[PDB]
């Protein structure tokens, strides 16, 4: 954990997570963000820090993905990548989804 | 919100999981 010892699960990019655009990056028992062309992670929360999970659908200027966490935050991903935004919002759905019932398990 | 955050035009989202908190 915190060092990079752990595998990478997906590679998004293009996203932009507070109107800055990076790349989002999933790994084994956590959930990572860093800007574009960066190395170091601005953001990581661990599926056990998940609560509940929304996704936005297509239709908007803007295609989104976020984690409600039991401490009541919310971390809202923006695939702004026209290529894969769409593809890969579900790529990570789904990663999420079935990680998620793994990690989650504490009645919080 | 303070500045241009997420819920700009953001909540419009099928909650995948909104029930389950086990």
């Known amino acids: 954990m915190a060092t990079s010892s752990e595998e990478v699960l997906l590679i998004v990019k293009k996203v932009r997570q507070k109107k800055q655009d990076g790349a989002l990056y999933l790994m084994a028992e956590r959930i990572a963000w860093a800007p574009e062309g960066k190395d170091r992670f601005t953001i990581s929360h661990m599926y056990a820090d998940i609560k509940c999970q929304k996704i936005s659908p297509e239709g908007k200027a803007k295609i989104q993905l976020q984690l409600v966490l039991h401490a009541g935050d919310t971390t809202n991903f923006h695939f702004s990548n026209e290529s894969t935004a769409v593809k890969e919002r579900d790529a990570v759905k789904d990663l999420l989804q079935q990680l998620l019932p793994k990690f989650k398990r504490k009645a919080n | ?22």
């Open chain 2, 1 to 22: 919100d303070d500045l241009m955050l997420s819920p700009d035009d953001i909540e419009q989202w099928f909650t995948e999981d909104p029930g389950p908190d086990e």
